Amino acid sequence: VQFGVMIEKMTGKSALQYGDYGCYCGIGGSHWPVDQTDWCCHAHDCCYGRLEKLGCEPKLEKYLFSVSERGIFCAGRTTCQRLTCECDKRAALCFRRNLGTYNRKYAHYPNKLCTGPTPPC
Ligand SMILES: [Ca+2]
Ligand SMILES: [Cl-]
Ligand SMILES: [Cl-]
Ligand SMILES: [Cl-]
Ligand SMILES: [Cl-]
Ligand SMILES: [Cl-]
Ligand SMILES: [Cl-]
Ligand code: NA
Numbered sequence: 001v002q003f004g005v006m007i008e009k010m011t012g013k014s015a016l017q018y019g020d021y022g023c024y025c026g027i028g029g030s031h032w033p034v035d036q037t038d039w040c041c042h043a044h045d046c047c048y049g050r051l052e053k054l055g056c057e058p059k060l061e062k063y064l065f066s067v068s069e070r071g072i073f074c075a076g077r078t079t080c081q082r083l084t085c086e087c088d089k090r091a092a093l094c095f096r097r098n099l100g101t102y103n104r105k106y107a108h109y110p111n112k113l114c115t116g117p118t119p120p121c
Contacts (some may be wrong), residue, residue, distance in 0.1 A: 019103035020108050024038050032114070035101055036094075042119060051087060
């Protein structure tokens, strides 16, 4: 699927290595993010919330994209598809930017370990 494919292209990792990382990557989220990669996911959730408030269904939207030397190019028939691509693009770029502190120990992080307050969007 789309976001997964973008994650793989931009990070060199498998999609599943971001699908359940930390306290925010993967469905829902609560408490304080564990690291910068997790912050990308906190922000991505916020981005999807903004799209939902605009009338989009970002968990369901399918979009088009290409990756060249110039970056990620988003596309789609509808504005909601293009918005979803923009949210994903920002998160995939955030993942790449933070590859230096990605830690395998936060993949499949048990949710009971998430503590502290929940940052606002
Ligand atoms: Ca999440
Ligand atoms: Cl951090
Ligand atoms: Cl965002
Ligand atoms: Cl491509
Ligand atoms: Cl880009
Ligand atoms: Cl590691
Ligand atoms: Cl790794
Ligand atoms: Na429109």
